[PDB]
Amino acid sequence: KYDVVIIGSGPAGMTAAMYTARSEMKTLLLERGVPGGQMNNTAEIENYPGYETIMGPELSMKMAEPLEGLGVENAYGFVTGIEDHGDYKKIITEDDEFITKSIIIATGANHRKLEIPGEEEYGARGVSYCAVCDGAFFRNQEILVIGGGDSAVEEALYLTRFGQSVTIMHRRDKLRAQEIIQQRAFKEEKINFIWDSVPMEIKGDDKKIQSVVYKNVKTGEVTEKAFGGIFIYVGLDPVAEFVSDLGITDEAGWIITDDHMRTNIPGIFAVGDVRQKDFRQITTAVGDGAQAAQEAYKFVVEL
């Protein structure tokens, strides 16, 4: 019935849908929340070719904008499962089922948790995974950022608009983030570093976080230090539970595709951050999405 259903409306899904609709495929784009995916939790995007700098939610709106006009059908849906029935596929949401000739899975990735004491308990007051979301709650505080990659260092730099100070704690003595972002963090006077350390416990009173206990990974020295907020950026997990049984994921749960965005299962493609891959950016999300759309066309034509 649908030619293609794209699940996920971040940049990978929104590029795919734009392309399948321009190929006049009957296109369903399901999104559980707000179009734009991780871009909505991004403050300042500087490396999307074609924009000098643009706030994550404004790029989201710009990418969502032509889709209605192109005839993509945009629907709310949280997908819980997919069944392959040979020459068609069934997609299960909370309340609905959809039938489609092909599927492009574009559901992205989610923050990994530390799994340390106080992490859940301080969920609402003190622990955050999203700085653009939560940052202004920590104006004038001592903020801790955990992680050494692009998200930790970038979101730390953003957070210096709010905090008295922002400390980045990394489990080695070299960051993983892009050098230009590393150099900005080194030079920013409001950013401090705790190198070679991992958080062990998040502590507080009944209401809120007050301190973090951490350990140095080369000496095992333990330190406890006061902070008002902790933002955790220790990497990603795939958002692909609705396909755990289909045999298209690796041991870590990322969806495996070839260079044409094809899984095992014909007519089921995956794009963007949910794929098994090393470089997760808006540019390669967009490129994956265009490549999946072109291959889904081919697959549906052939059917």
Ligand X SMILES: Cc1cc2nc3c(=O)[nH]c(=O)nc-3n(C[C@H](O)[C@H](O)[C@H](O)COP(=O)(O)OP(=O)(O)OC[C@H]3O[C@@H](n4cnc5c(N)ncnc54)[C@H](O)[C@@H]3O)c2cc1C
- Residues serving a catalytic function are 130, 133-134
Q: Which of 9, 15, 151, 263 binds a second copy (CB under 8 A)?
A: 15
What are the residue ranges of helices labelled H in the chain? 11-22, 56-64, 66-69, 131-134, 150-159, 179-187, 282-302
Q: From residue 131 to residue 170, what is the string marking binding to a second copy with x (rule CB under 8 A)?
A: ----------------------------------------
Contacted by 57, from ligand X, ligand NAP, a second copy, none: CB < 5 to 8 Å by type: none
What is the nearest approach in angstroms of ligand X to the Cβ of residue 282?
Answer: 4
Q: Which of the ranges 56-64, 218-226, 254-262, 278-286 carries the binding residues for ligand NAP, by CB under 6 A? A: 278-286
b/e burial code for range 80-96 (CB count within 10 A of at least 16 → b): eebebeeeebebbbeee
Four-point Cα dihedral 177, 183, 188, 190, nearest 10: 30
Beta-carbon count within 10 A of 196 CB: 17
Question: Sign of the C-alpha dihedral, residues 148, 132, 76, 62?
Answer: negative
113 belongs to the binding site for ligand X (CB under 6 A): no
Q: Which does 13 bind (CB under 5 to 8 A by kind): ligand X, a second copy, ligand NAP, none?
A: ligand X
Dihedral sign for Cα atoms in the order 292, 294, 295, 299: positive
Chain residues 56-115 in contact with ligand NAP, contact rule CB under 6 A: 114
Task: Single out the segment in contact with a second copy by CB under 8 A; choices: 65-73, 87-95, 137-145, 239-247.
Answer: 65-73
Report the partner that residue 77 touches, choosing among a second copy, ligand NAP, ligand X, none (CB closer than 5 to 8 A by kind).
ligand X
By CB under 8 A, is residue 18 in contact with a second copy? yes
Q: Which of 195, 187, 131 is nearest to 161 (CA)?
A: 131
User: Is 267 one of the binding residues for ligand NAP (CB under 6 A)?
Assistant: no
